[PDB]
């Protein structure tokens, strides 16, 4: 069976989380957690808490054997950008986009 967890409106651009999502796609969840634990990236902290949520969802809600799970899907989508303005030199103003992302992790025993 498949079980999902998501972190929506995470404070990172999708680009930065994807570097990390890619490390673990297709992996046994045990190896995925090890990989995430020793990836020095903020996005590794974010994705690990989602994977851990998915694992607990699967055990608690769907009766899964945590030994058997794999990260069968993982994808990062683009969230809303927060818009800001940064004063630059000579009275000129620049747009700042504070991008966010939606992190989805799917686990399954098959």
């Amino acid at each position: 069976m498949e079980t999902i967890a998501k972190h929506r409106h995470a404070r990172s651009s999708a680009q930065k989380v994807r570097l990390v999502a890619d490390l673990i796609r297709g992996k046994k969840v045990s190896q995925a957690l090890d990989i995430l634990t020793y990836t020095n990236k903020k996005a590794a902290v974010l994705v690990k808490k989602v994977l851990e949520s998915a694992i607990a969802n699967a055990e608690h809600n769907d009766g899964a054997d945590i030994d058997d799970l794999k990260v069968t899907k993982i994808f990062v989508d683009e969230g809303p950008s927060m818009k800001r303005i940064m004063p630059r030199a000579k009275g000129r103003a620049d747009r700042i986009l504070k991008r966010t992302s939606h992190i989805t992790v799917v686990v399954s025993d098959r």
């Binding site: 570097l19 990390v20 890619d22 490390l23 090890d34 990989i35 634990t37 020793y38 990836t39 990236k41």
Partner: protein, 56 residues
């Protein structure tokens, strides 16, 4: 200096063709504490090569 033409989504992806991270491949297990750890680093409970080297 700035572009005369908009680079493509194709080009962006080519540029990024070396950006992927490497997963750590060298974890070990301490033989006394059973903790995982980076090779040549102590463990979180402060074990190294089987000895408790740091009380913390």
């Amino acid at each position: 200096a700035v572009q005369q033409n908009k680079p493509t989504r194709s080009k962006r992806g080519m540029r990024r063709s070396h950006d992927a991270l490497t997963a750590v491949t060298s974890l070990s297990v301490d033989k006394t504490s059973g903790e995982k750890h980076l090779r040549h680093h102590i463990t979180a409970d402060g074990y190294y090569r089987g000895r408790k080297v740091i009380a913390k």
